[PDB]
Symmetry: C3
Subunit: 504 residues, 3 copies
C-alpha cells in the first residue's frame, strides 16, 4: 500500500501561535431545550441539589469545554438580567420573543455561575443591546464582579454568592445586523452603541475582554462593511470581533454525492472567511494608527441543517424541541476539519464557541427525561480540547487534490500538529476529505524542538450513519492501524475520515 | 327651480370598495374635558358603577362610533401606561406637559377597556414613543393581550380583567414630526424607531394591525418625505400610515365671504391630500418589492378653529379645564358632511378614519358638568353615514355648475357618494351643496345599481349658515325632512350651504 | 521708575456690558473631596445640624460665589438622581465610573439645596445625558420645581422641602463631546438629544434657562463645528452654550521658562475660544432667522495640572494585563488637589479680566472647583479651611466688579511665546457704577522676568481706595496646609502710577 500523501514538519518550523484554551468554548442559549431539558431538569433522576443534570455535567467535563457563552443569542435581545437573579420563587414568568416561548427564569446568571463552578468553565456573558443598553450592562457588571459594599454587589452576596463571579469576557449584545433581531440596528447605530458600552465597561474595569458582535454570517449584505465601521469606531476599548459560520450538506435529503463533497470541503470556506474578517479588523487598526490586533472570536461554529428553517390567545410553549439535529459521521468529519482550521489560525482566532452545547445543534443530546448521550461530533472536539496544548503548527502537506463544485480544487488531506515542549507531548489531527478515494499517509515529525501513543480513527463506510438514543455507540472512534518505520510512521485513512494521533 | 345638476350611477359611475366599519371611528384623548367630564364623571347623575356618564354613552351609540383611538394625541408622548392600571387609589397623580395639566390617572387602559366593552367599540391603542419606546410597548402588549401565566398578564387578571383585551390595532406613538411634540424626531430617527417597534410587536403577535404616524398635516415642511422615509424602512411590519387634516373658516371673525367659500370646498384639499399620502404608501411597497398595500388611517379629521388656539412658589396645573371646546355652525356641519363624502369616495385606500374628537374637545357630542349631553350640528351628518353607509361605495357621475374658490381652482358645486348593500337591497346617498350664494337643483338617477322606494330624506341647511347649537338651545339646528319628488328617477332642490342624506331600497 | 505702559479710557465710552452676577459662579462635583470632606463633613468641629462645614461656608461667602454648578461634571453621566433623595439611611451605595469611586449618596439634590439656601447661592443643576436622558430629566424637574399635588413633588414635600426649589439654570448633560465621558456622543446624536430635552423642559417651564454642551476645550477636534451643529438644531429652546477651558504650566516639573511664558498668556486662548464659540452661536441664530442671542456659559474654567490625572489613566489602562480588580473603589479620596503657585493665581486673574472684557456675550462663568478639588478653598480633615493663592483675585473681582464693564485702551511692550504670537504684557479691565462713584480696576503683568510701570488715566468715566498686589519673587511659591498665608495680597505703592513686578496681578478700587 504505497503512500500518496505526506504530513511533515520542515526543519526550522515556526509555530502559528500558542493554543488558547478559549478555542474550546461552547455556547448555551435560552433556546429550545438547551437549558430546560438540557443543563437543567429537576425532575430527572441525575439532577443535583440545584437541578442540574449530572450526566450532562459529566459529558461536558469529558468534552473538555473551557468557556461558555451565555445567555444568548437572539434570546438576550429582549432579556432582563434581573429576572434571573435571587430566589426562584420570587422570579417573574416572562416571554421570549426570539423563540416564541414562556420563560420561567428558573435559570439565570446566579444559577449559571453555580453551574459553571461545578463544570469548571469560564462564563462569556452577553448583555442586552436590543431592548436595553448602557445602564443595564453597567448594572450587571457591578452585580456580577463588584466588591461587597456597593448596592448591586450586596444583592449578589444576599443571593448566595459572596465572591465576585470574575466574568472577564463580555459580548456587547447579540448579532444586531439581522432583520429578525429584536431592536436590530444599522451598521452605524451599532457602531456608536458599542462605542458607548465598550468605553464605559473598560473605565469601570480595564481587565475586561470585550467582544463587538460582527455579522450574523457571510451571507449578510452588510458583511465586511459592518465589521469595519464598528471596529474603526470603538477600536480602543475592544479586544474581539465575533464571526459566525454554519455548514451543512445541501443535498442531504436526496443524498447527493456532489453536495456531500462540497460539504466535506467546508474548511476552505472557513479559511477564506477568517482571512476577510481578519482583514476588516486590520483596516480598523490601520485607520486608528494602533498597535494591537483585534482578535477574532468564532462564537458560533459547527454543523446546522438550516433548510428546516390580538388573534392568538394560547399561552406560549415551554421547552419546545428546537434545532435538535442528529449528526452523521460525515458531519463529525467536517467538524474535525473545522477545528483543524481553527488551530491552524489560532494566531488570529483566540476564541471559538461550538454552538450549541446541549440538545440545540449540539455534540451532547439529552432526551426528554431520558439518558444523555454523545453525538458523533462529540469525539473530534473532545480529543482536541483535551490534547491540543502548547503551540500549534501548520504542517507541510503534500496531498492529491479533489475537485469540488462549490470551492474548486481542494487538498484531500488537511492537518494540524500540536506540540507541548515541556510535557513533552504532542498531537496530530488530520482529515481525509476525499469522498471516494482512501489515501495512505506518512508522518515526519522531525522539526520539533518520537514515540507513538493512542491513535483514533472516526469512519463509517456509510457516511450517513448516526448515533441515536437507542444506539449511542453505533459510530465511535476506532483504534487506528498505524505502523512506525526510524522517524516516519504510516497510516491508511479511508474515504471521509478523521484521525487523531497522540505522541511523545 | 329646474334641473341644473345631476347625480347618476350609470357607466360613468365607478365603484370604490367595501365600506370599512373603522371609517366611522373616533378619538378620546386625555385633553381638557374629553375624558374627565366627558366619558368619565363619577359625580354625574347618570354615572354607572365605573364612573362613566351613561347619557354620553347613549349618544356614542347614537353617533355610530365603532373604534376609538386612545389615549392620544400629544398626551401619550409623556405618558407611563402603568400609571393607568390597578385600583384607582393606588395610581400616581402626574403632570401632562402636552396640555399643561395635572392628571389623576383615574382613567387608564383598564377603565377604557371597560368603557369600550359597554360602548361596543374597538380600541386603537397608542403607545409612548416620546419619553419611552420599545420596552414599554412590549410590556403593554403583554399586559393587555397575553394569556395568563406570565407576570404582566397575571397583573391584568389581578386588576380585575381575566380575559385578554384583544387590542388588534396599535399606534406607534403620536405625531413625532412636529416641534411641539415631546420627544419629537427627525424622519431618520422615527423610521429607525418604528422599524424596531413594529418588528418586535409583529414577532410577538402576527395578528396585529400596526400604524405608523405620518405628518401632523400637509403644512409641515417634512410632509411627503416623512411618510416615504418611515414606510420604506418599516414596510414589512406595517399595516397603516396615519394622516391628519383639520379645516376651518379662516375669516370667521369678520364673516368673510371669500374664506367661507374656501372652507366649503375643503374636501378638495382632502382629495389631493389623500392622493399624496397614497403615493408615499405606494413608494414603500414598490421599493420593498411587496404586494401588501399600506392602508391609510385618517386618525385625525374634522373641523377645528386652530387660529383661536391660545395659548401657545408656583401653582398647581389645572385639572380638566375647558380646552378646544368649539361650538359648531351649520356650515361647519356641511363641511364635515362633505369630508366624510371624500373619505367614503376614497375608502379603497383609507381603511380607517377617526373624527377628532369624540366628547367636548372639537366634538359632535358635548357634555356639561352635572348637566345634560347634547348634539352639535356636526353630530347629524356623521350619525347618518355611520349607521346607513354599508356594502359597496360608489363615486357617481356628477355634472354640476362650477363654483369659484380662492385657495383652489373652479370646483364642482355638488359632491356625492352612494352606498349600496346589494344583497340586503338597501342603499344611501350623501350629497352636499358647496355653493355659498346660489341654490341648486339635483336629478338623482339611482338606476344602475345591481326602482322605487325612498326612505328617510334629511336636509341640513340654515339661511344663516353661522347658526349654532348650544347648551341652552341644543336643537336650534337639526336635519329637516327633504322635499323629494320621484317622477323615475328622483329630483330635489338644495339651497346654498346644505347637506342631504336620502335612504333608499 | 519709568512709565512705559498706558491704561486709559478713550474719553467717550461706551462700555462692554453690565456685569452679570453669574460670572462669579463656581462648581461642586461629586469628585474627590469637593463634597465629602469639603462642603459636607458631619463630624467636623464646625459642622451644622445638616452636617455642612461652616468654616467652608464662611470662605464661600468671602469668595463671593453667586451660583454653583451641581453635581457634575463627569460624575453626572452615570448618576441616578433618585439615589440621592429621601432618607439617608435608605439611600443605595453606588459606583462612579468617572473617578473610580464608591458613592454613599449622603449628599444629593435635597441636601445641596439646603446647602445653597445656607450659602445664598443659586443652583445650576446638571442632568444625566450619558446613561440616562429625557424621561429622568423631566422627572427631576417635576420633583425639584413642581407644585405640591403630584407624585414626584409630594416626595419632595415628604422629604422635608415643601416649596419648589426654583432652579432656573439647567445643564443638559456634561462634556458629551469628550471620549472620556460615559455615553459620549457625536455632534448629530447630541443635537437630536438636546433638542428633545430642551424643548420638553421649556414646555413644562417657560422660565427655565437651558445650557447645551459645547466643547470640552479649544484643543478638541470637533471645536466650532460641534457648537454650530448642536445650536443650529436646538436653537429655539436653548439659552446658553457651555465653554470649558483649563490651563497649566506644561513644564512645571522642569521649571522651564518657555512653558511658563506660554502659561501666563493663557487668556489669549480664552479670547479666541470666546470669538469662535460666539461666531458659532451667531450662525445658529441667523440660520433660524432668530431674534434671540445664545449667551456663553464658561461653566468650567481655571488652572488644572491635568498631567497628573493623564498619567493615572495610562497606568490604569496598562493594568489590563494583571487581570480583574477585586478591591472596593475608594470613598472620597484625595484627587486633583492642586497646590496653587503665585503664578497660577496671576493667570486666573487675567482669565477673569478676559471674562469681564467679554461679559457682553459671556453672561455666566463657573470656576472649577469650589473646595479641595482644583480649588481656591482647601479644607483639611477634622481641621482648618484655608485660602489658596487663586482665592484672592476671585474674591476682589466678585465683591467689587459692579455696574458696567469697560475695556480700556492698552499700550504695553509685547512679549514672545511658543503657543501664541506676540502678546501684550499688560492686560486690564475697568468696572464702574455710575450711581455712584465706584469703581474698580484689575490689571495683570504677564512678563515673566521684566517688571513694568504703567500710567492710569480714567477720565472718560461717567481718589483711590484699597489697592492690592499679588506677587512673589519666587513665582512658584505656594500656600500650604502648614503655612496657609505665605502668599497674601500686599499693599500696592501708588493721573496715577504704580510699579508691577514680573508676574503680578493688581487690584485698585477708586471713587
Amino acid at each position: 500500500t504505497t503512500p500518496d500523501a505526506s504530513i511533515a514538519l520542515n526543519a526550522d518550523a515556526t509555530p502559528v501561535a500558542d493554543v488558547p484554551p478559549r478555542l474550546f468554548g461552547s455556547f448555551v442559549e435560552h433556546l429550545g431545550r438547551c437549558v430546560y431539558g438540557g443543563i437543567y431538569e429537576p425532575s430527572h433522576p441525575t439532577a443535583d441539589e440545584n437541578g442540574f443534570r449530572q450526566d450532562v455535567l459529566d459529558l461536558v467535563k469529558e468534552l473538555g469545554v473551557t468557556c461558555v457563552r451565555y445567555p444568548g443569542g437572539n434570546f438576550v435581545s429582549n432579556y432582563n438580567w434581573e429576572d434571573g437573579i435571587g430566589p426562584r420563587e420570587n422570579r417573574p414568568m416572562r416571554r421570549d420573543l426570539a423563540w416564541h416561548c414562556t420563560e420561567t427564569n428558573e435559570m439565570g446568571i446566579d444559577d449559571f455561575y453555580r453551574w459553571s463552578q461545578k463544570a469548571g468553565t469560564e462564563i462569556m456573558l452577553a448583555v442586552n443591546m436590543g431592548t436595553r443598553g448602557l445602564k443595564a450592562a453597567l448594572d450587571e457588571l457591578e452585580y456580577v464582579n463588584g466588591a461587597p459594599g456597593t448596592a448591586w454587589a450586596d444583592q449578589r452576596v444576599a443571593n448566595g454568592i459572596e465572591e465576585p463571579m470574575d466574568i472577564k469576557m463580555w459580548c456587547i449584545g447579540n448579532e444586531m445586523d439581522g432583520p429578525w433581531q429584536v431592536g436590530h440596528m444599522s451598521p452605524e447605530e451599532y457602531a456608536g452603541a458599542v462605542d458607548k458600552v465598550a468605553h464605559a465597561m473598560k473605565l469601570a474595569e480595564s481587565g475586561l475582554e470585550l467582544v463587538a458582535c460582527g455579522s450574523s454570517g457571510a451571507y449578510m449584505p452588510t458583511f465586511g462593511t459592518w465589521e469595519k465601521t464598528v471596529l474603526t469606531k470603538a477600536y480602543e476599548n475592544l479586544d474581539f470581533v465575533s464571526c459566525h459560520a454554519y455548514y451543512f450538506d445541501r443535498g442531504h435529503k436526496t443524498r447527493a454525492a456532489a453536495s456531500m463533497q462540497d460539504f466535506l470541503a467546508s474548511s476552505e470556506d472557513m479559511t477564506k472567511f477568517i482571512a476577510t474578517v481578519s482583514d476588516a479588523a486590520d483596516q480598523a487598526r490601520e485607520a486608528n494608527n494602533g498597535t494591537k490586533d483585534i482578535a477574532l472570536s468564532f462564537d458560533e461554529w459547527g454543523v446546522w441543517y438550516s433548510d428546516k428553517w390580538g388573534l392568538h390567545h394560547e399561552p406560549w410553549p415551554k421547552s419546545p424541541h428546537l434545532l435538535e439535529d442528529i449528526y452523521t459521521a460525515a458531519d463529525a468529519v467536517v467538524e474535525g476539519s473545522l477545528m483543524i482550521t481553527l488551530l491552524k489560525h489560532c494566531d488570529r482566532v483566540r476564541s471559538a464557541s461550538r454552538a450549541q452545547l446541549v440538545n440545540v445543534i449540539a455534540p451532547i443530546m439529552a432526551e426528554e427525561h431520558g439518558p444523555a448521550w454523545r453525538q458523533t461530533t462529540f469525539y473530534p472536539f473532545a480529543e482536541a480540547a483535551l490534547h491540543a496544548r502548547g503551540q500549534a503548527y501548520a504542517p507541510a502537506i503534500s496531498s492529491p487534490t479533489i475537485h469540488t463544485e462549490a470551492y474548486g480544487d481542494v487538498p484531500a488531506i488537511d492537518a494540524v500538529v500540536t506540540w507541548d515542549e515541556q510535557a513533552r507531548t504532542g498531537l496530530l489531527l488530520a482529515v481525509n476529505r476525499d469522498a471516494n478515494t482512501p489515501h495512505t499517509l506518512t508522518i515526519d515529525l522531525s522539526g520539533l524542538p518520537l514515540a507513538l501513543g493512542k491513535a483514533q480513527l472516526l469512519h463509517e463506510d456509510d457516511p450517513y450513519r448516526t448515533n441515536t438514543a437507542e444506539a449511542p455507540e453505533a459510530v465511535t472512534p476506532q483504534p487506528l492501524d498505524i505502523a512506525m518505520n526510524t522517524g516516519t510512521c504510516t497510516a491508511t485513512l479511508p474515504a471521509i475520515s478523521w484521525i487523531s494521533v497522540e505522541f511523545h
